[PDB]
Design a protein around this ligand. Structure first.
Ligand SMILES: [Mg+2]
Ligand SMILES: [Mg+2]
Ligand SMILES: [Zn+2]
Ligand SMILES: [Zn+2]
Lengths: 153, 99, 43, 40, 38, 50, 160, 120, 39, 177, 83
């Protein structure tokens, strides 16, 4: 990475960019012949929002998500983890990443709270307005229990 | 007329009541009722829901052995799920052959 | 709210009943043993 | 419960159908004599 | 302004976005091109 | 369509159950349904169906 | 360094339940026999007290002990005061151990003796089958035969 | 309208895949079909309910034997969807006259001639 | 530091005397789980 | 046993006081385990005629959380009796007005609709904060565990766990971040 | 060392089969409560009375009201005792 600073001198100003410590991965990829990281480490269907150790690696300090071209992820996976970090962002698991400056607990929330409207009336069983949980993207995760994931309550 | 068909209600009510009792004592020991009876019939013990419930009332030490007997069969069954054959069968999963 | 026209099981519009995996698992068991039957009463 | 398991080994799905749970004599004399067969 | 199920960008300046729970379409050069999702 | 019905993992289709009638389904069905197997329902057409 | 199938620690990396391992069978066989023989000499020495028993009779189970009454909804063709030895027992248990079968226990292991004391005609159970606005009604009174048994005593054999 | 459904005979032609599955060798075919009813007689045409009564399977969970011949095959074919079919096989030879009483059925379709009622 | 008997009760006094009763039964051998009278 | 008649019968059908911490738990799962403990289903001697129910105490009902947008989606509706008395309030607004409310009407649906309902409801106790009177805090028995594990935060994850977890990909140096 | 359940609250449980493998036996002596797991020992009217005892017994006020003579006479005066 590189850090840029804009310094303040009297009647002048200087902009300069310096290189910082470049982290790296471990020297033992478990699964070679993998183009994306989930295939190189076998995390294709065995991750979620709660295991935030890898999610912190695919974000910015303010809370911005990295691009696919520089990270090198699949299209299906790139849209998966950008969802999972949004679940973690709304859940409040990364309080140090509050973006830039000059009330209630919450978790497992697909959409944003402000934009979502209430349901003043729920229809009958055959037209019940059931609320959503998670997303259709992470449905492919292996379910250790026998019954499947209930995405809509 | 209500006295006649109430017998089938007496059967269903008392039957389902025993399910709640055995489901309760199992949860106290750390198991659930569907897995419980599955291990019992797998381990060849034909104890109906009356005595199975009533046993939990007066000797929880015995019902703990039934639960411990049941939980061990689950691990034997899961070990069988990993490898069906090609292994030594479970010691308690061994069956008696009548003829 | 949520009523339906007339009776619940007949007519131009009725309650739309839907399937459960229980009933699916039940009926496949009945026709797969019938496939076991189909093998045996042959030959 | 367990009916599918019992027929896997060849036993009756209902244990009351056949097997030692019912076919044996349900009572005998205290002196060891054999009781008569049951109607069932 | 106008509501409409399917959206269509009339001109290049038209851009569609997701805002407060619905699909909107805004155009600064042609304000009449605005189109809400229904 | 012809490769989907050839490569389908479901071993059960309208052809087998209808011609053999393993559960007495010919009651609910029509005789025209034997040639209108699964795709059709009155005038409609379900290309997703197989 | 890492196995190809290895995965880092996450919530879905491993199952939620804890991993377990069963003991080896050889020492278990010596454990199966050792715990049995100390119980065998326990009952021979007579450390136990009461002993309850479960019984399959008349197509239904009962939890029973000694000096306890029990009823059956039919006649056995036994004269009053006669004793009988019951064959089927699912399990019998004492204060500190239990003897469960597969499904029942052996004949030589137990000897459950019970006396027949009393026989009633059941109290009059009335039944009425009725249907509405069609003049369908009927009555019937049954007095089924009943017999009262009592388990006089239960004992166990040293054979095991 | 609904009528009696004629079945193509080609359906009842076992392929090698079916042979390896059910273990039924085509040569040396079995002789007798153990039949048992599961589906109710109700909500079925008049020809379906009287045939199963003509076969004598009004009672459910009651094993009853029939022949493996083309004539009786037509009967339980049209009402095949009301019953289970299982073949008859025995290691201990036909039931002798001395062992007529001590017979016993099994869930695997076996019919043991001897039944002494205790394990090995 | 070794137990002999345990007894429930409404209050501490009722539980104390009940636990005293529990010990007296097993001390004299009149427990409810004792050998019934043989015949 | 060797217990007397009345003391033994008393200890069997006696009541007990459970305790539960509602920090980062859903109102349903704590209601599910609570409701079965209110009738006394956990007792193997259960019978509906015998009121063998047990008390339950909840804490941190303010610090609860749903799974989904049910803070906004869910609506709790009631009718006073007059015309226009039908009103609706979101779970968020209802929480701001009464943090004790969400659980008490949530359990209210779980347990059956009998006359034993209101007896078991008042037997249950609720507190928004972890501050309890000494009277009801002293007569405790056991604190049953929570249904769901609470996920840890980045500040909570120790360093040895992060070091044990392997970094996955190489970032090119030519990147602002 | 492996155990199916924690043997620290009810009884020390261990299962055992005869060498032939036809019967199962169990040995479950009850646990001994350690000394460390212990502690040392140390008018009004209808309205106010019905509510204060309800708050005392943790129950409702309905059952405390008096019933009619219809139910008082139907109550059995010689109920049977078991054991
Ligand atoms: Mg039933
Ligand atoms: Mg209507
Ligand atoms: Zn991949
Ligand atoms: Zn425009």
């Amino acid at each position: 990475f590189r850090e840029v600073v804009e310094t303040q001198e009297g009647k002048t100003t200087i902009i300069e960019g310096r290189i910082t410590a470049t982290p790296k991965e471990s020297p033992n990829p478990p699964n070679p012949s993998g183009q994306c990281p989930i295939c190189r480490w076998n995390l294709k269907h065995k991750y979620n929002y709660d295991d935030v150790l890898l999610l912190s690696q695919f974000i910015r300090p303010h809370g911005g998500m990295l691009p696919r071209k520089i990270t090198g992820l699949c299209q299906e996976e790139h849209r998966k983890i950008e969802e999972c970090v949004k679940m973690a962002h709304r859940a409040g698991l990364l309080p140090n990443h509050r973006p830039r400056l000059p009330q209630l607990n919450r978790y497992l929330t697909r959409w944003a709270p402000g934009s979502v409207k209430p349901i003043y009336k729920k229809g009958p069983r055959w037209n019940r307005v059931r609320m959503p949980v998670g997303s259709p993207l992470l449905r492919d995760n292996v379910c250790y229990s026998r019954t499947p994931w209930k995405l809509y309550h | 007329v209500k006295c006649t068909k109430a017998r089938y209600l007496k059967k269903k009510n008392m039957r389902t009541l025993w399910i709640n009792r055995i489901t309760a004592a199992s949860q106290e020991h750390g198991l659930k009722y569907p897995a419980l009876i599955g291990n019992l019939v797998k381990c060849q013990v034909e104890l109906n829901r009356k005595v199975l419930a009533d046993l939990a009332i007066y000797e929880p030490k015995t019902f703990k052995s039934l639960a411990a007997l049941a939980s061990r069969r689950r691990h034997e069954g899961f070990a069988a799920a990993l490898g069906d054959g090609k292994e030594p069968e479970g010691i308690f999963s061994r069956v008696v052959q009548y003829h | 709210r949520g009523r339906i026209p007339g009776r619940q099981w007949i007519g131009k519009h009725r309650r739309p009943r839907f399937v459960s995996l229980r009933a699916k698992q039940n009926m496949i068991r009945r026709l797969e043993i019938e496939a076991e039957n189909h093998y045996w009463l042959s030959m | 419960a367990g009916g599918q398991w019992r027929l896997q080994q060849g036993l009756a799905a209902n244990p009351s159908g056949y097997g030692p749970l019912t076919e044996l004599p349900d009572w005998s004399y205290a002196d060891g004599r054999p009781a008569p067969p049951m109607k069932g | 302004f106008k509501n409409k199920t399917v959206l269509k960008k009339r001109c290049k300046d038209c851009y569609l976005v997701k805002r407060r729970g619905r699909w909107y379409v805004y155009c600064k050069t042609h304000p009449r091109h605005k189109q809400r999702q229904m | 369509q012809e490769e989907r019905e050839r490569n389908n993992q479901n071993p059960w289709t309208f052809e087998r159950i209808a011609t053999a009638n393993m559960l007495g389904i010919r009651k609910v069905l029509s005789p025209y349904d034997l040639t209108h197997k699964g795709k059709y329902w009155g005038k409609f057409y379900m290309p997703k169906r197989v | 360094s890492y196995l190809p199938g290895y995965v880092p620690k996450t919530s879905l990396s491993s199952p939620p339940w804890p991993e377990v391992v069963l003991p080896d069978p050889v020492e278990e066989t010596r454990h199966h026999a050792e715990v049995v023989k100390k119980v065998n000499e326990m009952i021979v020495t007579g450390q136990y007290g009461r002993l309850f028993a479960v019984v399959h009779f008349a197509s239904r189970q009962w939890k029973v002990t000694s000096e306890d009454l029990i009823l059956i909804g039919n006649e056995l063709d036994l004269a009053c005061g006669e004793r009988i030895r019951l064959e089927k027992v699912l399990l019998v248990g004492a204060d500190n151990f239990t003897l469960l079968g597969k499904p029942l226990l052996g004949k030589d292991l137990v000897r459950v003796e019970a006396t027949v004391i009393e026989k009633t005609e059941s109290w009059p159970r009335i039944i009425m089958r009725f249907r509405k606005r069609k003049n369908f009604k009927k009555k019937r009174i049954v007095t089924t035969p009943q017999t009262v048994l009592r388990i006089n005593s239960i004992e166990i054999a040293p054979c095991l | 309208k609904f009528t009696r459904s004629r079945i193509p005979e080609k359906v009842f032609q076992a392929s090698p895949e079916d042979h390896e599955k059910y273990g039924g060798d085509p040569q040396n075919p079995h002789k007798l079909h153990i039949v048992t009813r599961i589906k109710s007689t109700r909500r079925r045409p008049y020809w379906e309910k009287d045939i199963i009564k003509m076969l004598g399977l009004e009672k459910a969970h009651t094993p009853q034997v029939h022949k493996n011949i083309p004539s009786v095959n037509a009967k339980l074919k049209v009402v095949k969807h009301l019953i289970r079919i299982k073949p008859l096989k025995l290691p201990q030879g036909l039931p002798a006259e001395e062992n007529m009483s001590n017979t016993c059925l099994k869930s695997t379709g076996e019919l043991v001639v001897q039944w002494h009622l205790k394990p090995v | 530091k070794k137990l002999i008997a345990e007894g429930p009760g409404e209050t501490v006094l009722v539980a104390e005397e009940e636990a005293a009763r529990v010990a007296l039964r097993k001390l004299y051998g009149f427990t409810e789980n004792r050998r019934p009278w043989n015949y | 046993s060797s217990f007397s008649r009345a003391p033994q019968q008393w200890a069997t059908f006696a009541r007990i006081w459970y305790l539960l911490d509602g920090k980062m738990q859903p109102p349903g799962k704590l209601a599910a385990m609570a409701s079965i403990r209110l009738q006394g289903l956990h007792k193997p001697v259960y019978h509906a005629l015998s009121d063998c129910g047990d008390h339950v105490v909840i804490m941190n009902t303010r610090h609860i959380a749903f799974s989904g947008n049910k803070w906004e989606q869910k609506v709790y509706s009631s009718h006073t009796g007059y015309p226009g008395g039908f009103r609706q309030v979101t779970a968020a607004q209802l929480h701001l007005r009464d943090p004790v409310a969400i659980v008490k009407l949530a359990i209210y649906g779980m347990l059956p609709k009998n006359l034993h309902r209101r007896t078991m409801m008042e037997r249950l106790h609720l507190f928004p904060d972890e501050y309890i009177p000494e009277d009801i805090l002293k007569n405790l028995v056991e604190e049953l565990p929570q249904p769901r594990k609470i996920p840890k935060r980045l500040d909570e994850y120790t360093q040895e766990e992060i070091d044990a977890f392997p970094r996955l990909w190489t970032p090119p140096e030519d990147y602002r971040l | 060392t492996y155990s199916p359940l924690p043997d620290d609250y009810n009884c020390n449980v261990e299962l055992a089969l005869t060498s032939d493998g036809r019967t199962i036996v169990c040995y479950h002596p009850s646990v001994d409560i350690p000394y460390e797991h212990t502690k040392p020992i140390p008018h009004l009217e209808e309205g106010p009375m019905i509510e204060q005892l309800s708050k005392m017994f943790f129950t409702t006020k309905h059952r405390w009201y008096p019933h009619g003579r219809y139910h008082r006479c139907r109550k059995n005066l010689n109920p049977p005792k078991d054991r």
